[PDB]
Ligand binder design. Structure first.
Ligand SMILES: CC(C)(COP(=O)(O)OP(=O)(O)OC[C@H]1O[C@@H](n2cnc3c(N)ncnc32)[C@H](O)[C@@H]1OP(=O)(O)O)[C@@H](O)C(=O)NCCC(=O)NCCSCC(=O)c1ccc(Cl)cc1
Ligand SMILES: CC(C)(COP(=O)(O)OP(=O)(O)OC[C@H]1O[C@@H](n2cnc3c(N)ncnc32)[C@H](O)[C@@H]1OP(=O)(O)O)[C@@H](O)C(=O)NCCC(=O)NCCSCC(=O)c1ccc(Cl)cc1
Ligand SMILES: Nc1ncnc2c1ncn2[C@@H]1O[C@H](COP(=O)(O)O)[C@@H](O)[C@H]1O
Ligand SMILES: Nc1ncnc2c1ncn2[C@@H]1O[C@H](COP(=O)(O)O)[C@@H](O)[C@H]1O
Ligand SMILES: [Mg+2]
Ligand SMILES: [Mg+2]
Lengths: 503, 503
């Protein structure tokens, strides 16, 4: 195999004096050799402090040059980074770190989260990111350290994704998965090796796209990763021009915002260096696809994928957002919903898209054998995406098998929000749905029934969500206060019908 | 890993009814699904006849759809194909088959070779290719067979390479090597996944370029492989036009011939479909490069590589034939000649190019661990090429460490020809050199001295070479008959003086 460490090590031997990390706002630039030196220094320090290979270490930080260094240093040592969304609140972060039996937690989020981890009794050593590396500069002691033995099936990285109930699942990415999780960017997207590559780091590092397909791929191809700490679409387009960005890979949400900024820049706008605009994370709305086609340059590529199996379908110069086909690495099937992996659907019958679990695939969810058995069956990964084969022989993605909402490319299950809002004073029933939204894809929407003879307020419900343990980004954008909810003859709420009722 | 069998199997699930193999002159076309069926049928038949996984099977045939089916059927069964140049004569072939402990030999080269194999006592079962499959149509019997378990380090394919002495060595290519031996065509050459790929099969299947980088790459990317049975430059260019070929990978020898044909044909040929013109196998002479740039369309890419480690250096749109830099997968060093793998020379000093032995690398020469130890040392493969780092930070390929001649992308050692000509009646002393030649790169040249007072003739010596055990393509293109070789008091040839005298 070629591990992340190996890809980046080899890249640094080929292009030592070429810029690896650019942070234009902070005036920081690091060559491949400089980055390597810093990764080594941070690895040596962690090792001197006692950290061992195969130990799990949480990483909870927004995108920055410092977190890039920390993640790669953990991997260099042989520790398994468990990347966590820094927008999550203290109790959720502490409980995930506890259940993960992690050895340390590198955080940039800082004091209340740190206390939560301590009080949880996990025993994870809390490390402030700024105490490890600051503005690219490590605090190091200790000799150079050995290379850990990495084995193909062995845990390498952990990424989290939402289940239909409970806390997010910890997807274990094996060492062997790294190469294909990078190289689809060559085979599908058409990136090629070279120092010409200038990649805009829009996507979060704590998800597989922002990590493997953006950061690792940029450096592994001997190019430059441009760090973006906060998404501002006007500033982003200015970076494209300023850094001469050649490729950008983002959500339909990002691209709706970018294409709008592009249009608003007027008839003089030129973004000549940009050769690739790639999208993933959610269904690309047709309206967004039109603005992207009309206002941004480069080849447009739709990339369908999952945390668990990475890229499974794609489309170059798509005419619609729903239609894609398997590329290199990939084998796919559409099977009867609820049926076995061999129960392939007829002609144009709808079913669940399932994808072969090969090199790119996760090896299970940490400490969740039941959740794993539901998703990994007879060599296949079950996407929970509804799909159909077209007369053209392509795959049309139609929606979810489950009730998962996808907003800003983030999976949010309605139960997360229903659990919280169900305890808000005055609420007698709550059902949460996703409404079609050009910007967000699906907009989190609460349908709430007040106690008889009482009223409810969208402002008060929103306040309650914000003070709750629920991540702020997940809270409802809109509330519908209703006297009743549509129900079947078994008193279950007709969720899909309700979507049509309030849309 | 992703084995050859998996790449091709997955391709066939994605593009079943797309053309995989085209032989336009025979009117033979086979879809990916049709090819897989013929591969399965041949594999089943071979298993019925007693062939088993990891048994070695020689393949001795020129390029054809039938040998493609046979090689892939052997692999599908789990046998190890050992690909041999069909231009080698019967004694060399039989002895290589014997030395390899081959179970069987699939031959399209006739009864004399069959008899030599039989009489050698090797016990290798002789199989006529045309008795297995002919014009794409298999003779099918036997029940379905299992797809055997394949392991990363397990022998997958054997390819032959010449040493400084003795018979060619059998380089064992492991299962794990297939993927990077294909994917460098994406990262370096810029081929991408898709049915748009129409690849012209110029390169011999019995070397690693023609097999991995041409045949397997074409099919694995869901494209079409256009079979070429016999190279004729005008006919090849007509295939580019007729089949709308998008990529062609060949030697500088091929390209010299093609560029001349294209120059002559001018506007009567429409070559604009051709998007990639790639070269490897020998130093690209600057005069060939110039005419290639002038007369052939598409992006020009020089690929440096070896049987043992595949691609190690490249250059897009090269200005010279000798300067290249490492691409994806590759890590290189230049070390003191005769020194250890850690004895890196100072930039600007000449030394041996060595390349990291990673996933792509062979695992050793069959039954020759001494020869293996000379070439595979502490995780590095030693190329026997002399090289230097340029002030521009690139690698400049110079000569050989070992006197190897490279003619038409074929390695030939002078000793092979010298040992044969030393027995020709009338010959007393012989030195064989390779003279610079635009078409062949190096032209095999024999400097010969007659017995006292006798005469030699180029015609008689040529006749002797042709009737000898030496492969015909290796025989001298030119003879210099001399009264005496220039030699010192030690009776040793003043090589520089000789080359000067005949150049
Ligand atoms: C679009 C982003 C940047 C948010 O926009 P922005 O930066 O303007 O937000 P902000 O931080 O300034 O706050 C502005 C207000 O918006 C709210 N917000 C934030 N995120 C979301 C969201 N996801 N949904 C709904 N609301 C959101 C946020 O709460 C704030 O309002 P406030 O709290 O009232 O201040 C953010 O949602 C994002 O980075 N999304 C990308 C997530 C991602 O990386 N997804 C892919 C993960 S792997 C998945 C996958 O499917 C896949 C696909 C292909 C392959 Cl090959 C492999 C895997
Ligand atoms: C250029 C070829 C096609 C020969 O041309 P052509 O087809 O016109 O010859 P032909 O069979 O019609 O007979 C015409 C007369 O030329 C004579 N000939 C044949 N081959 C050669 C040769 N290599 N050197 C000198 N003379 C040659 C042949 O004997 C015939 O005269 P005759 O015997 O009088 O009929 C042939 O030499 C060839 O196919 N060469 C390609 C060799 C090759 O595949 N090399 C790469 C192997 S792997 C090596 C490697 O370096 C690498 C590189 C990159 C990577 Cl990534 C991995 C590995
Ligand atoms: N290009 C795309 N088109 C449609 N849906 C997508 C695309 N990329 C990702 N998704 C959705 O996002 C889910 C993956 O998110 P996660 O479960 O966090 O890995 C997939 O199962 C799809 O529902
Ligand atoms: N692009 C190239 N430029 C110069 N020499 C090459 C190139 N490709 C292959 N070679 C030569 O061919 C040899 C590989 O042949 P082999 O190891 O027998 O497959 C190398 O050691 C080089 O001498
Ligand atoms: Mg913002
Ligand atoms: Mg011929």
């Amino acid at each position: 195999m070629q591990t992340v460490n190996e890809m980046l090590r080899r890249a640094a031997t080929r292009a030592p004096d070429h810029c690896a990390l650019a942070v234009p706002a902070r005036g920081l630039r690091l060559t491949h050799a400089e980055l390597r030196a810093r990764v080594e220094a941070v690895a040596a320090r962690l090792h001197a402090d006692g950290l061992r290979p195969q130990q799990r270490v949480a990483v909870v930080a927004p995108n920055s040059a410092d977190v890039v260094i920390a993640i790669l240093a953990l991997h260099r040592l042989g520790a398994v980074p468990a990347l966590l969304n820094p927008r999550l609140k203290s109790a959720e972060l502490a409980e995930l770190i506890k259940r993960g039996e992690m050895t340390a937690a590198v955080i940039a989020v800082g004091r209340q989260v740190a206390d939560a981890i301590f009080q949880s009794g996990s025993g994870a050593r809390i490390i402030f990111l700024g105490d490890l590396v600051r503005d690219g500069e490590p605090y190091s002691y200790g000799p150079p350290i050995e290379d850990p033995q990495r084995e193909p099936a062995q845990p390498a990285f952990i990424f989290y994704t939402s289940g239909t109930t409970g806390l997010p699942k910890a997807a274990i990415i094996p060492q062997r998965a790294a190469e294909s999780r990078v190289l689809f960017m060559s085979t599908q997207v058409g990136l090629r090796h070279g120092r010409h590559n200038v990649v805009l780091g829009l996507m979060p590092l704590y998800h597989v796209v922002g990590f493997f397909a953006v950061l690792v791929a940029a450096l592994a191809l001997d190019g430059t990763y441009v760090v973006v700490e906060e998404f501002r679409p006007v500033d982003a387009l200015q970076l494209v021009q300023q850094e001469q960005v050649t490729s950008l890979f983002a959500t339909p949400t990002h691209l709706d915002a970018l294409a709008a900024a592009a249009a608003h820049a007027g008839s003089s706008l030129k973004l000549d260096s940009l050769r690739h605009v790639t999208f993933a994370g959610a269904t690309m709305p047709d309206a967004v696809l039109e603005t992207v086609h009309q206002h941004l340059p480069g080849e447009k590529v739709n990339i369908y994928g999952t945390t668990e199996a990475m890229n499974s379908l794609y489309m170059r110069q798509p005419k619609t957002g729903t239609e894609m086909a398997p590329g290199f690495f990939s084998e796919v099937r559409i099977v009867r919903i609820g049926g076995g992996v061999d129960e392939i659907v007829a002609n144009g019958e709808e079913g669940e898209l399932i994808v072969a679990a090969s090199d790119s695939a996760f090896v299970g969810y940490l400490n969740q054998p039941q959740a794993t058995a539901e998703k990994l069956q007879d060599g296949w990964y079950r996407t929970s995406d509804v799909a159909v084969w077209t007369p053209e022989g392509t795959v049309r993605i139609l929606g979810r098998v489950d009730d998962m909402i996808i907003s800003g490319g983030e999976n949010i299950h309605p139960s997360e929000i229903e659990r919280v809002l169900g305890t808000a004073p005055g609420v007698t029933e709550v059902v949460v749905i996703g409404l079609a939204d050009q910007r967000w894809g699906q907009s989190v929407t609460a349908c709430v029934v007040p106690r008889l003879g009482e009223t409810l307020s969208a402002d008060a419900l929103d306040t309650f969500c914000r003070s709750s343990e629920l991540a702020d980004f997940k809270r409802p954008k809109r509330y519908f206060i209703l006297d009743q909810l549509p129900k079947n003859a078994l008193n279950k709420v007709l969720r899909r019908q309700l979507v049509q009722q309030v849309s």
